[PDB]
Amino acid sequence: IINRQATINIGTIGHVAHGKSTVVRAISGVQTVRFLERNITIKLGYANAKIYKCQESFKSDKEISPKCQRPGCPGRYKLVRHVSFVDCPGHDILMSTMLSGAAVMDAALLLIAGNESCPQPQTSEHLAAIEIMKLKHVIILQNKVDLMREESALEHQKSILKFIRGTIADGAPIVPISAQLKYNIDAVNEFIVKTIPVPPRDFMISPRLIVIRSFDVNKPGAEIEDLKGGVAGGSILNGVFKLGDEIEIRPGIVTKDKGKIQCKPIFSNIVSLFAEQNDLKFAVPGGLIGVGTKVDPTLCRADRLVGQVVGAKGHLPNIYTDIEINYFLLRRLLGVKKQAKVRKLEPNEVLMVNIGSTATGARVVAVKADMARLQLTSPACTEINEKIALSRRIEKHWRLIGWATIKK
Amino acid sequence: TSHCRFYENKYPEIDDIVMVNVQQIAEMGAYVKLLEYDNIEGMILLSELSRRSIQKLIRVGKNDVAVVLRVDKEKGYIDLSKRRVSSEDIIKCEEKYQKSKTVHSILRYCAEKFQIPLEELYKTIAWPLSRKFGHAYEAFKLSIIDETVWEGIEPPSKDVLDELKNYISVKIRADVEVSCFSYEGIDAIKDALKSAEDVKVKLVAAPLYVLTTQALDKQKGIEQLESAIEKITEVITKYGGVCNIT
């Protein structure tokens, strides 16, 4: 078996205590770490998957196990692609992590249960978000199908079909698969091979890195001096890294808390890399890699720096405080249990603007008809245009309004 | 089994002091067992016991200081007196008794260990210590400070002796919180640790470092810990990091 790492990212969406983690487990082999010291930093889940060919009726394709025995052929599998999974929870309070996950993702999998409530706005909202964030590769999957009646499922499918056609996602495949009884995943695997292609990626463009998770390597058992460096789980979109480069977290931090601040952002060199199971040399983008840099084990532990941009020495981007946004509004609101109508923008009110992955608070000053000027409270960086989703407040918690683009 | 005399000989002399533990009173006086000179009974008549409600007390547990009058060194008969003992050397006598008790206590591990008669063990112990030196507790103390009495006798059980020695033979905690922001960190932490060690140091989770400092003579503790804290403070401020001490 060759040690070729991740190439393309696939994600999973749903609801709490429904069936996403179970699905992930079914897909993979080794159990995940996520769900204070271990794993606890962000609500996002990271898991891997295998694409192995064995082609030497119509539906049979490949087996997840390293050695296939169930169909018949005892031959050795062809290496085509290795993939990394990002698990994102659809809880009503926390969605920043989900948003962050979306930015790195290039394939989306929808999972809704069968033996519960049918019309849910959250799923629709998720779909809308997917449509917005540069995606056409949408696969619909049904979770709990085994505890369902003979025609009810069919009816549900029909209803779904009726619902979904007038969207950005054109020819979306719909597959019903069980996660608790372990069946029918072959079809899914086949689909994964068929529908999803690989976009071009080269060494030319300057590196862009996003760190979601943070880890510390301190476990009880050994004596006093048995220490390892701080590991930062960072996923790459474009820009290849080799061992021997300086990694920096962009926004910066306060040095004394009186006294003026002028200290540059935190620089760190790579000590030990963690990919799939163990160590590797080259970092091919399109996967979440636990990069172990010279950042403190005391710093990376809790909710302090979740979802921030990472650059390299040599190339310099720009940091902004006043942001410029062009907005597009929707007809009626998404993600509300009954539906409510969208009001026009009002001056002097706290609203949350999500640019790419960051969750930041913004205040409205001057809006004519298309352009919007906003004031930031927590630091944020700007590169090109980014995938922007707006969130406004009416009652209790956050609600989506529409999509946005930066004009410069 | 508990037997064997405290001194070298079985039967007491004239004018010597003994401590008695009372079992029963009335009719005769107190024909009771001794805790200074063998477990065999020694008697006082109802006259020498008191001087100055007399019958109200003296039952079980209470100790009496008495001087030996008449000894029959043939079969086993002891006579005692309480009135003659003056309150000038009584404290000394008490001290002696205490010492004897301590010695007896010391001779128990051996009895426990090799499952052999206690009297023989006592005899083997008493030949270097109780014979030449005088009193045994002081000799024991001397031995524990500077080995001087154990030279005269060969040990059938050295392990037991070692155990005894061990038997004959204060941890203070400190809190340090680390939360850096500068370039280098792990190395700095290591350096800090190296300035607060010298015995037992352990790691718990992530932000807290727990060290236990051993005290020589009770009061000592602040005279190193504070210095260590100061050193730590000196360490972390230069680069661009903050640490807190509660």
Swiss-Prot record, chain A:
Region described as G1: spans on this chain: 14-21
Gene Ontology MF annotations: GTP binding; GTPase activity; methionyl-initiator methionine tRNA binding; translation initiation factor activity; translation initiation factor binding
One BP term from GO: translational initiation
Effect listed in the UniProt record for changing residue 112 to A: No effect on cell population growth
Region (G3): 87-90
Effect of residue 379 to S: Mildly impairs eIF2 complex function
One GO location term (cellular component): eukaryotic translation initiation factor 2 complex
Name of the protein in question: Eukaryotic translation initiation factor 2 subunit gamma
Quaternary state and interactors: Eukaryotic translation initiation factor 2 eIF2 is a heterotrimeric complex composed of an alpha, a beta and a gamma subunit. The factors eIF-1, eIF-1A, eIF-2, eIF-3, TIF5/eIF-5 and methionyl-tRNAi form a multifactor complex (MFC) that may bind to the 40S ribosome. Interacts (via C-terminus) with CDC123; the interaction is direct. Interacts with GCD1. Interacts with the eIF2B complex subunits GCD6 and GCD7. Interacts with methionyl-initiator methionine tRNA.
Region: G4, residue numbers: 143-146
Purpose: As a subunit of eukaryotic initiation factor 2 eIF2, involved in the early steps of protein synthesis. In the presence of GTP, eIF-2 forms a ternary complex with initiator tRNA Met-tRNAi and then recruits the 40S ribosomal complex and initiation factors eIF-1, eIF-1A and eIF-3 to form the 43S pre-initiation complex (43S PIC), a step that determines the rate of protein translation. The 43S PIC binds to mRNA and scans downstream to the initiation codon, where it forms a 48S initiation complex by codon-anticodon base pairing.
Positions of GTP binding: 17-22, 143-146, 178-180
Localization annotation: Cytoplasm, Cytosol
Full protein segment contained here: 94 to 519 of 527
Record keywords, A-Z: Cytoplasm, GTP-binding, Hydrolase, Initiation factor, Nucleotide-binding, Phosphoprotein, Protein biosynthesis
Phosphoserine found at: 152
Disruption phenotype: Inviable.
tr-type G domain mapped to chain residues: 5-201
UniProt superkingdom: Eukaryota
From Swiss-Prot, chain B:
Claim: Transmembrane is one of the keywords in the record: no
Keyword terms, alphabetized: Cytoplasm, Initiation factor, Phosphoprotein, Protein biosynthesis, RNA-binding
Compartments where located: Cytoplasm, Cytosol
Modification Phosphoserine, positions: 50
Any GO MF annotation of the entry: ribosome binding
Keyword Iron-sulfur set for record: no
Post-translational modification: Phosphorylated; phosphorylation on Ser-50 by the GCN2 protein kinase occurs in response to low amino acid, carbon, or purine availability. Phosphorylation inhibits the guanine nucleotide exchange factor activity of the eIF2B complex.
GO biological process entries: formation of translation preinitiation complex; translational initiation
Substitution effect: residue 50 to D: Weakly impairs derepression of GCN4 expression in amino acid-starved cells
Subunit structure: Eukaryotic translation initiation factor 2 eIF2 is a heterotrimeric complex composed of an alpha, a beta and a gamma subunit. The factors eIF-1, eIF-2, eIF-3, TIF5/eIF-5 and methionyl-tRNAi form a multifactor complex (MFC) that may bind to the 40S ribosome. Interacts with CDC123; the interaction is direct. Interacts with GCD1.
Miscellaneous note of the record: Present with 17100 molecules/cell in log phase SD medium.
Name of protein: Eukaryotic translation initiation factor 2 subunit alpha
Organism: Saccharomyces cerevisiae (strain ATCC 204508 / S288c)
